[PDB]
Ligand SMILES: Nc1ncnc2c1ncn2[C@@H]1O[C@H](CSCC[C@H](N)C(=O)O)[C@@H](O)[C@H]1O
């Protein structure tokens with residue numbers, strides 16, 4: 001998970017990039033509710049029973065509370081156009097060692113929904129069948145369930161020596177990450193298909209590839225990852241860590257294209273794609289912020305870098321990292337495509353529509 | 355307001371110092387099974403349709419492991435009765451406690467191989483925490499003796515109820531006892547009112563609560579009563595030693611009432627939403643074991659640390675419990691052979707129709 005607590009070094013504080021992905025997403029949520037949530041004359045959405053919303057990969061706030069409020073307000077508005085007012089039951093899902101204490105203690109005091117936290121991997125079932133009316137998953141599905149094992153094997157064609165992720169040219173490494181993404185995302189869709197009612201909606205926001213692009217190393221995320229790797233190799237060359245510690249390190253992430261997502265969705269065959277698109281990030285016009293970015297990377301990578309290297313490594317690594325961001329300021333400010341956030345609006349198919 | 359048990363899973367934590375409360379749940383297993391068999395009207399009942407999940411809620415769950423044992427007992431019993439009917443539903447189990455309960459520790463110790471979906475619900479159970487008409491089986495063990503607040507009249511210097519030089523009641527202080535009883539009637543009624551809205555017609559609620567043993571009027575003749583009495587005298591010993599001032603003890607009181615069966619029935623009749631199907635006293639498994647001074651002292655600290663730290667500094671806990679353990683030693687024979695050990699009361703309630 002992300003860094004816990006509500007420190008200045010936490011994810012409650014250094015998650016503002018994902019907040020703007022939520023803010024321009026509000027229009028995706030509002031539009032999906034108004035155009036595609038079939039409340040009227042539909043007993044699936046009977047307002048005498050609760051309207052159940054789930055956020056998958058909710059972290060610790062505040063972003064999850066803004067997304068949940070958006071869903072609640074849109075859905076409540078559509079129901080009031082039919083002179084109905086349901087109770088809302090909102091579920092916050094994340095890994096078991098997500099900091100749910102911090103989430104619960106941050107729950108908005110004036111909230112008009114019932115709340116629960118749901119611990120467990122969303123690559124598994126975490127809800128009873130046929131119980132979720134609106135599902136939400138923002139900036140979480142690029143995290144794989146594991147590093148694909150063959151890139152950790154020295155004897156494999158896919159061994160990822162000297163790097164910590166993929167850039168898109170290493171054909172064996174990229175194939176391995178994609179195979180892992182297919183298996184993970186398929187398992188996510190399998191579990192969600194069982195939990196989500198017929199006609200229920202699922203909104204997904206995920207770091208991805210802009211369409212047509214082959215090279216992950218030409219998005220922001222790809223260069224940031226490439227530069228985390230070279231920064232670690234700088235620690236190697238100073239001798240502060242050994243080469244083997246980096247050769248054995250890999251990020252468990254895959255950033256899919258639209259095509260990648262559609263292929264898995266269509267093979268799963270349980271959801272119809274109602275809309276797919278890119279999210280124009282609000283901080284698009286702003287000047288590239290070398291330091292703020294360094295601290296957003298650290299807030300994301302702290303747990304996993306600390307698990308593999310010492311937490312000793314964080315301060316000297318990210319002061320090398322900031323130097324490489326500054327040296328690549330031009331690329332990040334001007335030359336990398338400023339639209340790599342994809343979104344999907346899915347609708348659970350009826351049982352006679354498969 | 356909210357005084358949860360000591361968090362974490364260290365050797366001073368509630369999770370490692372709650373063996374007496376586990377004994378309560380152990381002896382209650384027989385009560386759960388009899389209530390499911392004789393009073394849970396599954397067969398041909400649309401309310402318990404096994405195509406919908408069977409929802410169980412534990413109110414005052416704390417951090418485990420006691421809550422897991424209780425929940426497993428309800429699932430197994432309800433499972434068995436559904437099987438005898440050729441059905442097999444999914445179970446959705448909700449763990450409710452105060453917002454500042456250590457839900458992280460609860461979630462991290464969830465039994466790995468379990469046959470229910472799990473969710474945590476932060477919030478006071480003197481309020482509504484679930485949608486209406488959604489819970490089929492409620493459970494509440496060793497929580498409902500905690501009031502929502504201290505009765506204001508025992509804090510009033512002007513009142514004959516002013517609880518000077520003490521932190522609870524023994525039963526001889528008729529004004530203090532009346533105040534605590536009045537607060538219990540309001541709180542327990544609010545609890546029942548909220549559960550009545552949440553529990554389905556024919557749903558069961560099983561309550562275990564430390565109480566007044568049958569035919570006993572002096573709370574100080576129970577283990578809990580003497581433990582609180584000695585915690586007050588230990589505090590007054592700290593006053594004598596200059597470690598705390600006298601006013602801080604005068605102004606401190608435990609927000610607890612330990613009702614008799616008649617106290618409980620009177621509130622249940624007044625609320626008029628549940629029938630009492632079963633009621634009695636649980637035989638407690640540790641009844642014949644010799645009093646254990648160090649564990650009892652640790653159990654009390656685990657329960658009281660939060661509320662003691664809020665009123666007195668945290669600097670007061672080690673000195674207070676050094677004196678407390680000493681006072682428990684001096685009173686060994688009173689706990690061992692003189693206190694009434696039959697103070698664990700239970701209720702089986704059923705939610706009434708229309
Ligand atoms: N398999 C999985 N199951 C549950 N949560 C997961 C997960 N994989 C990643 N996550 C969670 O997804 C979160 C990514 S940060 C995203 C937080 C929030 N959705 C937002 O928009 O800001 C982390 O909390 C991480 O623990």
Ligand SMILES: Nc1ncnc2c1ncn2[C@@H]1O[C@H](CSCC[C@H](N)C(=O)O)[C@@H](O)[C@H]1O
Pocket residue numbers: 357358359372375376379413414415416417420421450451452455477478479480494495496497500502
């Ligand atoms: N108003 C309230 N709302 C929710 N939980 C409460 C509460 N008042 C007390 N509690 C909780 O009830 C628990 C009592 S300790 C008992 C825990 C568990 N049922 C067991 O058998 O061991 C504590 O965790 C306390 O925080």
